[PDB]
Design an enzyme around this catalytic site. Structure first.
Site, PDB file in Angstrom:
ATOM      1  N   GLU A  35       0.813  -1.206   0.000  1.00  0.00           N
ATOM      2  CA  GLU A  35       0.000   0.000   0.000  1.00  0.00           C
ATOM      3  C   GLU A  35       0.852   1.263   0.000  1.00  0.00           C
ATOM      4  O   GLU A  35       0.529   2.227  -0.700  1.00  0.00           O
ATOM      5  CB  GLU A  35      -0.936   0.006   1.211  1.00  0.00           C
ATOM      6  N   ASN A  46      -7.210  10.721  -5.360  1.00  0.00           N
ATOM      7  CA  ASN A  46      -7.789  10.010  -6.494  1.00  0.00           C
ATOM      8  C   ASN A  46      -9.016  10.729  -7.046  1.00  0.00           C
ATOM      9  O   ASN A  46      -9.786  11.340  -6.299  1.00  0.00           O
ATOM     10  CB  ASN A  46      -8.183   8.584  -6.102  1.00  0.00           C
ATOM     11  N   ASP A  48     -11.781  11.424  -7.488  1.00  0.00           N
ATOM     12  CA  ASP A  48     -13.041  11.806  -6.863  1.00  0.00           C
ATOM     13  C   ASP A  48     -12.849  12.774  -5.704  1.00  0.00           C
ATOM     14  O   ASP A  48     -13.834  13.220  -5.106  1.00  0.00           O
ATOM     15  CB  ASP A  48     -13.809  10.570  -6.380  1.00  0.00           C
ATOM     16  N   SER A  50     -11.344  12.014  -2.836  1.00  0.00           N
ATOM     17  CA  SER A  50     -10.939  11.255  -1.665  1.00  0.00           C
ATOM     18  C   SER A  50      -9.445  10.957  -1.728  1.00  0.00           C
ATOM     19  O   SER A  50      -8.835  10.918  -2.799  1.00  0.00           O
ATOM     20  CB  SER A  50     -11.729   9.952  -1.556  1.00  0.00           C
ATOM     21  N   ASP A  52      -6.147   8.588   0.005  1.00  0.00           N
ATOM     22  CA  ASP A  52      -5.606   7.502   0.809  1.00  0.00           C
ATOM     23  C   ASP A  52      -4.440   8.029   1.635  1.00  0.00           C
ATOM     24  O   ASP A  52      -3.524   8.662   1.092  1.00  0.00           O
ATOM     25  CB  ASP A  52      -5.153   6.346  -0.082  1.00  0.00           C
ATOM     26  N   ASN A  59      -8.674   5.359   3.253  1.00  0.00           N
ATOM     27  CA  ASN A  59      -9.279   6.329   2.344  1.00  0.00           C
ATOM     28  C   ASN A  59     -10.012   7.400   3.152  1.00  0.00           C
ATOM     29  O   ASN A  59     -10.533   7.137   4.244  1.00  0.00           O
ATOM     30  CB  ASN A  59     -10.255   5.645   1.383  1.00  0.00           C
ATOM     31  N   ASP A 101     -15.399  -5.247   9.621  1.00  0.00           N
ATOM     32  CA  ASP A 101     -16.661  -4.914   8.973  1.00  0.00           C
ATOM     33  C   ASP A 101     -17.280  -6.081   8.218  1.00  0.00           C
ATOM     34  O   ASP A 101     -18.476  -6.035   7.909  1.00  0.00           O
ATOM     35  CB  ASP A 101     -16.461  -3.742   8.006  1.00  0.00           C
TER      36      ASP A 101
END
Ligand SMILES: [Cl-]
EC number: 3.2.1.17
Length: 129
Positions: A35, A46, A48, A50, A52, A59, A101
Site C-alpha cells: 500500500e 484520487n 473523486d 478522496s 488515501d 481512504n 466490517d
C-alpha cells in the site's frame, strides 16, 4: 518515516494485530508494504477527491476526516492528519475498525492483488520477533 520490514512487523505485533479477526501478522506486513512501502507519510489523491492516507492508505471517504472531501463519512472518528503521524497507533486502530466490517482485509486493494492467497509468512520471516 519509512519503516523497516520487521521494525513494522514488531510494531504491528506489539499493537495486537497478530491474527486479528483471522489475519496473521504476515497479512498486515505485506499489505502495508504494497500500500505504501512502509511509509507513514504516503498519500494518494484520487480523481473523486478522496485521499488515501498513512501506512495503510486508509481512504478519506469512509474512515477519516480531512475537511476537503464532499462524501464524506468519518467512521473511525479521526482526522486523516493523525493517520500521517510517525506513530502507527491511529492507523492501527482505524484498521481494526475497518477489518472488523466483514469485508476484511479485502478493503485494501493492494493486499488483495498482491498478498491475498500467498505464503504471507515470508514477510515476518527472519524478523527476530
Ligand atoms: Cl497491485
Amino acid at each position: 518515516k519509512v519503516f523497516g520490514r520487521c521494525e513494522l512487523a514488531a510494531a504491528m505485533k506489539r499493537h495486537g494485530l497478530d491474527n486479528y479477526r483471522g489475519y496473521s501478522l504476515g497479512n498486515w506486513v505485506c499489505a502495508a508494504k504494497f500500500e505504501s512501502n512502509f511509509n507513514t507519510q504516503a498519500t494518494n489523491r484520487n480523481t473523486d477527491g478522496s485521499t488515501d492516507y498513512g501506512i495503510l492508505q486508509i481512504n478519506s471517504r469512509w474512515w477519516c476526516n480531512d475537511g476537503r472531501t464532499p462524501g464524506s463519512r468519518n467512521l473511525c472518528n479521526i482526522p486523516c492528519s493523525a493517520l500521517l503521524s510517525s506513530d502507527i497507533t491511529a492507523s492501527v486502530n482505524c484498521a481494526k475498525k475497518i477489518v472488523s466490517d466483514g469485508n476484511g482485509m479485502n478493503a485494501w486493494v493492494a493486499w488483495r492483488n498482491r498478498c491475498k492467497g500467498t505464503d504471507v509468512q515470508a514477510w515476518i520471516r527472519g524478523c527476530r520477533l
